[PDB]
Each structure stands twice: as C-alpha cells, then as structure tokens.
PDB file of all heavy atoms in Angstrom:
ATOM      1  N   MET A  14     113.014 152.691 101.646  1.00  0.00           N
ATOM      2  CA  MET A  14     113.462 153.214 102.967  1.00  0.00           C
ATOM      3  C   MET A  14     113.601 154.685 102.980  1.00  0.00           C
ATOM      4  O   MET A  14     113.493 155.320 104.008  1.00  0.00           O
ATOM      5  CB  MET A  14     114.751 152.438 103.416  1.00  0.00           C
ATOM      6  CG  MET A  14     115.299 152.926 104.765  1.00  0.00           C
ATOM      7  SD  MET A  14     116.363 151.672 105.560  1.00  0.00           S
ATOM      8  CE  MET A  14     115.352 150.196 105.722  1.00  0.00           C
ATOM      9  N   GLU A  15     114.051 155.404 101.851  1.00  0.00           N
ATOM     10  CA  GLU A  15     114.399 156.808 101.901  1.00  0.00           C
ATOM     11  C   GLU A  15     113.184 157.805 102.391  1.00  0.00           C
ATOM     12  O   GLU A  15     113.478 158.759 103.014  1.00  0.00           O
ATOM     13  CB  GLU A  15     114.806 157.131 100.449  1.00  0.00           C
ATOM     14  CG  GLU A  15     115.425 158.578 100.333  1.00  0.00           C
ATOM     15  CD  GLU A  15     115.921 158.942  98.934  1.00  0.00           C
ATOM     16  OE1 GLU A  15     115.624 158.183  97.887  1.00  0.00           O
ATOM     17  OE2 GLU A  15     116.663 159.902  98.700  1.00  0.00           O
ATOM     18  N   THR A  16     111.935 157.391 102.162  1.00  0.00           N
ATOM     19  CA  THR A  16     110.883 158.139 102.718  1.00  0.00           C
ATOM     20  C   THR A  16     110.791 157.840 104.235  1.00  0.00           C
ATOM     21  O   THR A  16     110.672 158.843 104.988  1.00  0.00           O
ATOM     22  CB  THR A  16     109.489 157.728 102.132  1.00  0.00           C
ATOM     23  OG1 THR A  16     108.947 156.671 102.903  1.00  0.00           O
ATOM     24  CG2 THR A  16     109.649 157.320 100.715  1.00  0.00           C
ATOM     25  N   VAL A  17     110.966 156.629 104.707  1.00  0.00           N
ATOM     26  CA  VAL A  17     110.836 156.262 106.095  1.00  0.00           C
ATOM     27  C   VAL A  17     111.842 157.069 106.847  1.00  0.00           C
ATOM     28  O   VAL A  17     111.603 157.462 108.054  1.00  0.00           O
ATOM     29  CB  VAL A  17     111.063 154.793 106.326  1.00  0.00           C
ATOM     30  CG1 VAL A  17     111.588 154.498 107.673  1.00  0.00           C
ATOM     31  CG2 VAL A  17     109.724 154.042 106.086  1.00  0.00           C
ATOM     32  N   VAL A  18     113.045 157.405 106.276  1.00  0.00           N
ATOM     33  CA  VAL A  18     114.117 158.156 107.037  1.00  0.00           C
ATOM     34  C   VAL A  18     113.674 159.578 106.915  1.00  0.00           C
ATOM     35  O   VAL A  18     113.522 160.309 107.990  1.00  0.00           O
ATOM     36  CB  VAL A  18     115.474 157.996 106.348  1.00  0.00           C
ATOM     37  CG1 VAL A  18     116.443 159.007 106.772  1.00  0.00           C
ATOM     38  CG2 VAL A  18     115.932 156.543 106.619  1.00  0.00           C
ATOM     39  N   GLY A  19     113.564 160.153 105.714  1.00  0.00           N
ATOM     40  CA  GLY A  19     113.261 161.585 105.571  1.00  0.00           C
ATOM     41  C   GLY A  19     112.086 162.151 106.379  1.00  0.00           C
ATOM     42  O   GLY A  19     112.198 163.238 106.904  1.00  0.00           O
ATOM     43  N   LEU A  20     110.959 161.407 106.582  1.00  0.00           N
ATOM     44  CA  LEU A  20     109.899 161.955 107.317  1.00  0.00           C
ATOM     45  C   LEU A  20     110.179 161.864 108.901  1.00  0.00           C
ATOM     46  O   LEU A  20     109.545 162.561 109.606  1.00  0.00           O
ATOM     47  CB  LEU A  20     108.666 161.034 106.993  1.00  0.00           C
ATOM     48  CG  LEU A  20     108.063 161.408 105.629  1.00  0.00           C
ATOM     49  CD1 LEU A  20     106.780 160.478 105.426  1.00  0.00           C
ATOM     50  CD2 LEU A  20     107.511 162.838 105.540  1.00  0.00           C
ATOM     51  N   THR A  21     111.196 161.126 109.319  1.00  0.00           N
ATOM     52  CA  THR A  21     111.579 161.202 110.707  1.00  0.00           C
ATOM     53  C   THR A  21     112.352 162.374 110.983  1.00  0.00           C
ATOM     54  O   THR A  21     112.387 162.860 112.155  1.00  0.00           O
ATOM     55  CB  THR A  21     112.335 159.856 111.176  1.00  0.00           C
ATOM     56  OG1 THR A  21     113.578 159.760 110.646  1.00  0.00           O
ATOM     57  CG2 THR A  21     111.435 158.602 111.053  1.00  0.00           C
ATOM     58  N   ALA A  22     113.088 162.994 110.068  1.00  0.00           N
ATOM     59  CA  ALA A  22     113.735 164.270 110.290  1.00  0.00           C
ATOM     60  C   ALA A  22     112.721 165.441 110.546  1.00  0.00           C
ATOM     61  O   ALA A  22     112.868 166.280 111.411  1.00  0.00           O
ATOM     62  CB  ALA A  22     114.684 164.598 109.030  1.00  0.00           C
ATOM     63  N   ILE A  23     111.602 165.326 109.854  1.00  0.00           N
ATOM     64  CA  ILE A  23     110.441 166.332 110.118  1.00  0.00           C
ATOM     65  C   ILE A  23     109.686 165.981 111.357  1.00  0.00           C
ATOM     66  O   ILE A  23     109.394 166.911 112.073  1.00  0.00           O
ATOM     67  CB  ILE A  23     109.542 166.249 108.806  1.00  0.00           C
ATOM     68  CG1 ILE A  23     110.276 166.595 107.480  1.00  0.00           C
ATOM     69  CG2 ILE A  23     108.292 167.158 109.047  1.00  0.00           C
ATOM     70  CD1 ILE A  23     110.542 168.077 107.326  1.00  0.00           C
ATOM     71  N   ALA A  24     109.548 164.700 111.671  1.00  0.00           N
ATOM     72  CA  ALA A  24     108.916 164.349 112.916  1.00  0.00           C
ATOM     73  C   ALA A  24     109.707 164.847 114.129  1.00  0.00           C
ATOM     74  O   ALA A  24     109.142 165.449 115.041  1.00  0.00           O
ATOM     75  CB  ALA A  24     108.768 162.726 112.939  1.00  0.00           C
ATOM     76  N   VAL A  25     111.077 164.721 114.170  1.00  0.00           N
ATOM     77  CA  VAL A  25     111.887 165.244 115.169  1.00  0.00           C
ATOM     78  C   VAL A  25     111.825 166.703 115.233  1.00  0.00           C
ATOM     79  O   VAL A  25     111.698 167.337 116.381  1.00  0.00           O
ATOM     80  CB  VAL A  25     113.276 164.695 114.912  1.00  0.00           C
ATOM     81  CG1 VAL A  25     114.437 165.436 115.708  1.00  0.00           C
ATOM     82  CG2 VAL A  25     113.487 163.238 115.251  1.00  0.00           C
ATOM     83  N   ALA A  26     111.811 167.412 114.155  1.00  0.00           N
ATOM     84  CA  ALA A  26     111.734 168.901 114.125  1.00  0.00           C
ATOM     85  C   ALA A  26     110.375 169.361 114.709  1.00  0.00           C
ATOM     86  O   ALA A  26     110.387 170.333 115.529  1.00  0.00           O
ATOM     87  CB  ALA A  26     111.866 169.352 112.724  1.00  0.00           C
ATOM     88  N   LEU A  27     109.243 168.676 114.493  1.00  0.00           N
ATOM     89  CA  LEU A  27     107.989 169.001 115.103  1.00  0.00           C
ATOM     90  C   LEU A  27     107.965 168.766 116.511  1.00  0.00           C
ATOM     91  O   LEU A  27     107.573 169.529 117.333  1.00  0.00           O
ATOM     92  CB  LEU A  27     106.861 168.211 114.375  1.00  0.00           C
ATOM     93  CG  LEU A  27     106.112 168.971 113.317  1.00  0.00           C
ATOM     94  CD1 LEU A  27     106.997 169.697 112.281  1.00  0.00           C
ATOM     95  CD2 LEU A  27     105.173 167.940 112.545  1.00  0.00           C
ATOM     96  N   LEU A  28     108.531 167.593 116.901  1.00  0.00           N
ATOM     97  CA  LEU A  28     108.515 167.085 118.242  1.00  0.00           C
ATOM     98  C   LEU A  28     109.268 167.957 119.211  1.00  0.00           C
ATOM     99  O   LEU A  28     108.842 168.135 120.318  1.00  0.00           O
ATOM    100  CB  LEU A  28     108.936 165.627 118.194  1.00  0.00           C
ATOM    101  CG  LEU A  28     108.763 164.736 119.402  1.00  0.00           C
ATOM    102  CD1 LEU A  28     107.331 164.839 120.073  1.00  0.00           C
ATOM    103  CD2 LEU A  28     109.035 163.359 119.120  1.00  0.00           C
ATOM    104  N   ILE A  29     110.412 168.477 118.691  1.00  0.00           N
ATOM    105  CA  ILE A  29     111.323 169.417 119.559  1.00  0.00           C
ATOM    106  C   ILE A  29     110.850 170.821 119.404  1.00  0.00           C
ATOM    107  O   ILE A  29     110.767 171.590 120.445  1.00  0.00           O
ATOM    108  CB  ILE A  29     112.775 169.259 119.185  1.00  0.00           C
ATOM    109  CG1 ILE A  29     113.251 167.804 119.521  1.00  0.00           C
ATOM    110  CG2 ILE A  29     113.642 170.232 119.876  1.00  0.00           C
ATOM    111  CD1 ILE A  29     114.704 167.582 119.216  1.00  0.00           C
ATOM    112  N   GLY A  30     110.462 171.295 118.248  1.00  0.00           N
ATOM    113  CA  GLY A  30     110.009 172.662 117.951  1.00  0.00           C
ATOM    114  C   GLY A  30     108.698 173.089 118.626  1.00  0.00           C
ATOM    115  O   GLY A  30     108.663 174.129 119.148  1.00  0.00           O
ATOM    116  N   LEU A  31     107.728 172.228 118.591  1.00  0.00           N
ATOM    117  CA  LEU A  31     106.463 172.541 119.303  1.00  0.00           C
ATOM    118  C   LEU A  31     106.671 172.454 120.799  1.00  0.00           C
ATOM    119  O   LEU A  31     106.004 173.364 121.521  1.00  0.00           O
ATOM    120  CB  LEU A  31     105.407 171.524 118.810  1.00  0.00           C
ATOM    121  CG  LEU A  31     105.062 171.641 117.386  1.00  0.00           C
ATOM    122  CD1 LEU A  31     104.059 170.539 117.003  1.00  0.00           C
ATOM    123  CD2 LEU A  31     104.248 172.935 117.063  1.00  0.00           C
ATOM    124  N   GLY A  32     107.505 171.702 121.240  1.00  0.00           N
ATOM    125  CA  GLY A  32     107.933 171.629 122.754  1.00  0.00           C
ATOM    126  C   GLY A  32     108.633 172.864 123.153  1.00  0.00           C
ATOM    127  O   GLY A  32     108.289 173.533 124.137  1.00  0.00           O
ATOM    128  N   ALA A  33     109.652 173.318 122.269  1.00  0.00           N
ATOM    129  CA  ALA A  33     110.344 174.590 122.661  1.00  0.00           C
ATOM    130  C   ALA A  33     109.372 175.813 122.577  1.00  0.00           C
ATOM    131  O   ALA A  33     109.463 176.670 123.375  1.00  0.00           O
ATOM    132  CB  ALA A  33     111.409 174.693 121.490  1.00  0.00           C
ATOM    133  N   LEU A  34     108.460 175.853 121.622  1.00  0.00           N
ATOM    134  CA  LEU A  34     107.451 176.954 121.563  1.00  0.00           C
ATOM    135  C   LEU A  34     106.571 176.998 122.745  1.00  0.00           C
ATOM    136  O   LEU A  34     106.434 178.078 123.379  1.00  0.00           O
ATOM    137  CB  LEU A  34     106.690 176.613 120.230  1.00  0.00           C
ATOM    138  CG  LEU A  34     105.482 177.564 120.015  1.00  0.00           C
ATOM    139  CD1 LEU A  34     105.916 179.018 119.761  1.00  0.00           C
ATOM    140  CD2 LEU A  34     104.617 177.130 118.770  1.00  0.00           C
ATOM    141  N   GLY A  35     105.936 175.877 123.158  1.00  0.00           N
ATOM    142  CA  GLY A  35     105.179 175.847 124.281  1.00  0.00           C
ATOM    143  C   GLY A  35     105.906 176.129 125.637  1.00  0.00           C
ATOM    144  O   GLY A  35     105.413 176.952 126.348  1.00  0.00           O
ATOM    145  N   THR A  36     107.041 175.545 125.890  1.00  0.00           N
ATOM    146  CA  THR A  36     107.840 175.781 126.979  1.00  0.00           C
ATOM    147  C   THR A  36     108.399 177.226 127.126  1.00  0.00           C
ATOM    148  O   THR A  36     108.384 177.905 128.178  1.00  0.00           O
ATOM    149  CB  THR A  36     109.013 174.784 127.087  1.00  0.00           C
ATOM    150  OG1 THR A  36     108.590 173.577 127.592  1.00  0.00           O
ATOM    151  CG2 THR A  36     110.166 175.210 127.983  1.00  0.00           C
ATOM    152  N   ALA A  37     108.695 177.884 125.983  1.00  0.00           N
ATOM    153  CA  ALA A  37     109.177 179.219 125.987  1.00  0.00           C
ATOM    154  C   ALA A  37     108.074 180.216 126.266  1.00  0.00           C
ATOM    155  O   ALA A  37     108.282 181.177 127.014  1.00  0.00           O
ATOM    156  CB  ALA A  37     109.891 179.514 124.566  1.00  0.00           C
TER     157      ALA A  37
END
C-alpha cells in the first residue's frame, strides 16, 4: 500500500500545479 499512497501525493501535486501554471 505505501507506493499506492505516495504516488497519489505526486499525482495531486501535478494535477493542481499544472492547472495553476496554465490558469496563471
């Protein structure tokens, strides 16, 4: 399970960060 969790922290960072970059 520890990989399944840790890769969702990176997924969330990409999903919000690329959105913030494009919208800004």
Side-chain angles (χ1 to χ4, degrees):
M14 184 159 299
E15 191 176 11
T16 89
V17 151
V18 166
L20 286 179
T21 66
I23 300 288
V25 163
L27 261 50
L28 192 52
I29 294 175
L31 294 172
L34 173 65
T36 281

